[PDB]
């Protein structure tokens, strides 16, 4: 009766601000986990008032901007962003993202769009 396994085939998959998201559909108040694929960048800056965003970099190389501070990131690195921190990133990377407490779109806040020319990837 209990669903333990979620697959890519059954996931919701869409593009948002230059990234390709795989949202498995996990429901759990403690955290939710998604895949993020980025070719050149996440061309938007945002923050989340409630949840920490933890990015594990599966492959590739990029750079996060966290409250405007550059944080280089590469394969096998863990990037740990606390709540209420402005986020954007450039790069060519495959990542696994944890949002803890569970992602709620109501908690996210748009700061600005970013020109695609700003990414050096
Ligand atoms: O369940 C989730 C988790 C993350 N994201 C999005 O993934 C990006 C993470 O950088 C942000 O645009 C964030 O809103 C979603 O859309 N849904």
Residue numbers in the entry: 1 to 121
Excerpt from the publication:
In pacidamycin 3, biosynthesis the 3′‐deoxy moiety is mediated by Pac13, an enzyme found to catalyze the key dehydration of uridine‐5′‐aldehyde 1 to form 3′‐deoxy‐3′,4′‐didehydrouridine‐5′‐aldehyde 2. Pac13 is the only monomeric, metal‐free cupin dehydratase characterised to date.
Initial soaks with uridine‐5′‐aldehyde 1, the natural substrate, were problematic due to both turnover and the inherent instability of this molecule. In order to overcome this problem we used substrate analogues, uridine 7 and uridine 5′‐uronic acid 8, which enabled us to obtain liganded complexes of the enzyme, providing the first clues of the location and structural determinants of the active site. Both ligands occupied the same binding pocket in their respective co‐crystal structures. Within the ribose pocket, the 5′ oxygen lies almost equidistant (2.5–2.7 Å) between Y55 and Y89, with a slightly shorter distance to Y89, whereas the 4′ proton and 3′ hydroxy are 2.7–3 Å from H42. The oxyanion could then be stabilised by hydrogen bonding by Y55 and Y89, and the protonated H42 could then act as the acid, donating a proton to 3′ hydroxy group of the substrate and thus generating a better leaving group.
